[PDB]
UniProtKB/Swiss-Prot annotation, chain A:
This is Large ribosomal subunit protein uL15. One of its GO terms (cellular component) is cytosolic large ribosomal subunit. The modification Phosphoserine is found at S67. PROSITE patterns: RIBOSOMAL_L15. It holds the Pfam family Ribosomal_L27A. The gene is RPL27A. The modification (3S)-3-hydroxyhistidine is found at H38. Keywords: Acetylation, Cytoplasm, Hydroxylation, Phosphoprotein, Ribonucleoprotein, Ribosomal protein. Residues 1-29 have a biased composition (Basic residues). It is found in: Cytoplasm.
UniProtKB/Swiss-Prot annotation, chain C:
The modification N-acetylserine is found at S1. It comes from Oryctolagus cuniculus. It is found in: Cytoplasm. The keyword Ribosomal protein applies. Pfam families: Ribosomal_L28e (PF01778). Keywords: Acetylation, Cytoplasm, Isopeptide bond, Phosphoprotein, Ribonucleoprotein, Ribosomal protein, Ubl conjugation. Belongs to the eukaryotic ribosomal protein eL28 family. Its main location: cytoplasm. This is Large ribosomal subunit protein eL28. InterPro entries: Ribosomal_eL28, Ribosomal_eL28/Mak16. Component of the large ribosomal subunit. GO terms for molecular function: structural constituent of ribosome.
Curated annotation (Swiss-Prot), chain D:
The gene is RPL32. GO terms for cellular component: cytosolic large ribosomal subunit. The modification Phosphoserine is found at S61. Keywords: Cytoplasm, Isopeptide bond, Phosphoprotein, Ribonucleoprotein, Ribosomal protein, Ubl conjugation. This is Large ribosomal subunit protein eL32. It is found in: Cytoplasm. It holds the Pfam family Ribosomal_L32e. Component of the large ribosomal subunit.
UniProtKB/Swiss-Prot annotation, chain F:
Keywords: Cytoplasm, Isopeptide bond, Phosphoprotein, Ribonucleoprotein, Ribosomal protein, Ubl conjugation. Component of the large ribosomal subunit. The ribosome is a large ribonucleoprotein complex responsible for the synthesis of proteins in the cell. This is Large ribosomal subunit protein uL24. It comes from Oryctolagus cuniculus (Rabbit). Gene3D superfamilies: 2.30.30.30. It is found in: Cytoplasm. InterPro entries: KOW (IPR005824), Rib_uL2_dom2 (IPR014722), Ribosomal_uL24_CS (IPR005825), Ribosomal_uL24_euk/arc (IPR005756), Ribosomal_uL24_KOW (IPR041988), Translation_prot_SH3-like_sf (IPR008991).
Amino acid sequence: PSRLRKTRKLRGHVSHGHGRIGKHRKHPGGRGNAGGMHHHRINFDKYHPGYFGKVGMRHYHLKRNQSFCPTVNLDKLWTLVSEQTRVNAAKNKTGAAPIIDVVRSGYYKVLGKGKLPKQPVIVKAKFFSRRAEEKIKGVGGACVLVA
Amino acid sequence: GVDIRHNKDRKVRRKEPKSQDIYLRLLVKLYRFLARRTNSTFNQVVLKRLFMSRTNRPPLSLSRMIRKMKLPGRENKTAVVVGTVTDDVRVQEVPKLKVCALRVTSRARSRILKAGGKILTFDQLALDSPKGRGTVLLSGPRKGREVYRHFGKAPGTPHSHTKPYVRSKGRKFERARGRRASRGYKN
Amino acid sequence: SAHLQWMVVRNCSSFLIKRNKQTYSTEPNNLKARNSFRYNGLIHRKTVGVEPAADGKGVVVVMKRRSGQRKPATSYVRTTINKNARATLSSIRHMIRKNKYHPDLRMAAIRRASAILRSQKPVM
Amino acid sequence: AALRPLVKPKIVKKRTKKFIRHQSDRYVKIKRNWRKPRGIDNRVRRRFKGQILMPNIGYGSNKKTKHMLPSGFRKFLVHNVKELEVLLMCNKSYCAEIAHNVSSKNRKAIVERAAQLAIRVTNPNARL
Amino acid sequence: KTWRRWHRRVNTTQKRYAICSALAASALPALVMSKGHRIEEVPELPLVVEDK
Amino acid sequence: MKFNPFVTSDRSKNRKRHFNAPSHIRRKIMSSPLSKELRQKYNVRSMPIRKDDEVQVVRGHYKGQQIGKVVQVYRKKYVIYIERVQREKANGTTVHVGIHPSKVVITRLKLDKDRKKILERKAKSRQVGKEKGK
RNA sequence: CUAAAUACCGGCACGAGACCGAUAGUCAACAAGUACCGUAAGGGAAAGUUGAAAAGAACUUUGAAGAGAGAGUUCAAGAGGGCGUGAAACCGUUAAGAGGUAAACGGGUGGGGUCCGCGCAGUCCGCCCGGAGGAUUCAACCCGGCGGCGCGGUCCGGCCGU
RNA sequence: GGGACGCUACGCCGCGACGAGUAGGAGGGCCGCUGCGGUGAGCCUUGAAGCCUAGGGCGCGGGCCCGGGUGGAGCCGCCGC
């Protein structure tokens, strides 16, 4: 909508919203990110700290497929299986703990961020955290490694 | 000649919502009558919040509403939320509740009614409690947006922890001179 | 409902016309011919309408029933009054006040009928 | 013998002369329509004495007498016969005016319908 | 230029929302009158006709 | 609506075909309906006109019930010339007034070996709509 | 060695447009890469519209003729051959007004024109009274139809339940 | 225990205070142009657009509607784009 833009209200105004002393010239400060070690030093330090310099090790042929290790917290652990299995787990008097295969839903590591409900589980995952294991053992569950 | 400043003689606030939808406007029309005819300030907070923008009336998660009803106005007491009532997946047990909201997510309607709860709209709230009697008014985390992490004191400044504007985070993306004590300086 | 449909017809309606700093509506049952919530003939469940007679002598009074709300062929019933000036205004007053049929427009129908009878009066 | 309005208030106008453009008399390319000057050294822009007055909000007419004809009515553009029956409940306040492109045989359709409804016409005998 | 953004995409839920609003407003007698339709003689506005 | 994708609906293109049509196409555009007495006998709606056909004028300033024959067919002007359809020049000579073939009804045809062949052929497919259509 | 998915401002034939409308849109809507310019490489225009149909003004008269005056065609020559509509700058003529501080302008009046108000005897509308009139005429009953409401204190039966 | 108006609620009404402006910013335009989807049982050779106008007027204003002349074939109002 060009009718809703600013240029429709600027008709009849000489400087077109750009001033009379500092005319809207072509490139007063330089094109692009010019002047990092120069006249644009303060903006590059007060808003982008760490822009200039090298740090860390180079890695020539990096494949993002190798580093794929998605994580899941203990908050949304019971959301992986359906709600029907959660009701029957506490309802069952034999103590048959349902199995939640973390790799099946698309995660590899389990992190112990959240609280677990007091009913046993069997957790199959590719990796585990230290705190995630003690929370599972605290309820009376088992951590099963799988590859 | 009068030596007064017209710089801030015009208060900036919302008189009517910028939304053009007609269902909110009919609810706004209902609560304009309740504000100027009843003596309760509840009809003054609801009417003020009905004008507010989407970022001003943040969604309220279900687990927060359980948490604030674990410390309620001493138990039958309804919940009034101007925003949207969203569902939380890291909550196990939900009690029966009386919830008033402009919008409720579809999973949250099934979860509340499965526990024997009740969901009311704002026109039903006026028929139930015209003055807001026996009501708890709640709101979501206003600073819960990711936008506020970029706000405040600018980065590259001592004790000014604020997320910078970076296209992608990595080892060579604003970890150099402005951050390293080995390279130049740090704050 | 009445308030829900009013927010739609208030600006984007075919019967509404706006020119010369004025706003009018050409609805068949919009007596006083003004775009307003009270006077809209299509919006409300109960509607009073005053129109000139088909033969030019008398007035027809449009009465809207509450049974067939989505049945516009049956919802409207029309009665023709071809009596004297005093008796015509007495009947339209009786159909609105004594039936409690949308009573805020009783005098507006009286004003419209008093001019339609004057319009069909022989011109000097 | 014309159609009187309901009331005849005293029409007051703060200014009746048109607001002419600055230096509109000096040039033909400069039209009479008002344009607000925005020059740095413009005498009219900074309200010099003895210069062209600029339109302000203080020249607005009274809301009671705004858009009212000297006869006491307010105009309404009418294209066909069907638009006449709108004004029969606005008879003593608003008048009807026929459009320029209305044919002569359709103008002589309109006039008598407003005469039966006692609706005042600004231009009844236009073509004849 | 030819590469001006001519086309616009709408969410699937929003596309289905307006159709539901369009169908629901077609059953109210007052709204269809405002579209100028000359159907005052129609017996029932939700006009359902046999499959013949 | 037209449904053929290869048939032009453009106004500028259609006028280009009409004003730049070749001479054998010009004759086909110049077709005029037959008189009503011919129409049950030949079962033909309209037909291209030739040099010697009896013509009544239906529209224009020269319309009437007079019977006149064609003088010539001027395919370059979209104009035919009828016998007594003419106006007076200034110098005293007479000039034939041009009448478009659309405002022309034929009361008598010019029968020929090639003329007669079209009559059954136009009446053949005219009937075909009444066996296939019925 | 090897097709398919792929590209296509050249060419052939197409269809279409929320595009532009003769200073726009291709340079070129027209005898346009033409007229024209430069030794050459190359540069490169301007230019659409009578009328429905020429029915393109027969004939008379002045002038050497160009050009007119009559007459005629047309619905219209106020469409008369670069002719539809014909603005402004500019010029010619008619009417009015004015004129030694260049002209022009703002505010306030006054005078003169211009047409308009179709004003030239100044408002009608209701309620009551009077008397002159003229009706098929009022209230109240009977019959039929229609509509509204009902807390019928809760009549009966249908239909639905976000 | 038988009765005036009203209320396009984005509407109407009542109180007080104030009104400068360059660069610059914001809001309202029933200010204006062009084309598209709707809409006015819209206008129109008994005269469209365009143009001229010593007339009547409206709006603070951008501008707009009638009256007269010319013109001969299209044009506009409202809701959105």
